[PDB]
């Protein structure tokens, strides 16, 4: 009833949130993830669950942006609605993912949030360590 992290993704990034799973769930971070193709039951509203899960149930928000979540309505009203919850981002609430290259811009009302950057080969080390150690803290 109470997770870690609601998990914002489009069906593209599937790979890399089961990815997540792995690395933060199955290992002894022992995170709870809220991913919504598992842990959302059907019948439930889209918006209202959505609003129900991020702002209640889920301690912070970690958005996995691509050139595909992009196009995703479902995700945009999601992250605008995270963001909503800390405009100045004082709580440390809403978490962007970057896992591969893209071709198109950055969200705008994203762009002085620090991601969590998963291409640069120099940094990657320290990825899942500082992610984790995100979602962990109150």
């Known amino acids: 009833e109470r997770f870690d ?4 993704y489009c069906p593209s990034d ?3 949130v089961q990815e997540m799973i792995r690395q933060l769930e199955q290992t002894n971070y022992r995170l709870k993830l809220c991913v919504s193709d598992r842990d959302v039951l059907p019948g439930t509203c889209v918006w209202s669950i959505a609003s129900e899960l991020i ?3 889920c301690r912070r928000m970690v ?9 995703s ?6 992250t605008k609605f995270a963001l909503s919850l800390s405009p100045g981002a004082h709580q440390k609430r809403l978490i962007p993912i970057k896992y ?12 002085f949030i620090t991601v969590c950057d998963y ?6 080390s320290w990825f899942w ?9 109150p």
């Open 129 to 137: 360590t500082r992610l984790a150690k995100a979602l962990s803290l």
């Open 63 to 71: 958005v996995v942006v691509s050139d595909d979540y992009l196009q």
């Open 73 to 78: 309505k479902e995700c945009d009203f999601q």
């Open 14 to 16: 599937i790979q890399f």
């Open 100 to 111: 591969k290259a893209m071709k198109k811009e950055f969200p705008s009302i994203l762009r």
């Open 119 to 124: 291409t640069n080969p120099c940094t990657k």
């Open 5 to 8: 992290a609601f998990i914002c």
């Open 55 to 57: 702002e209640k149930r």
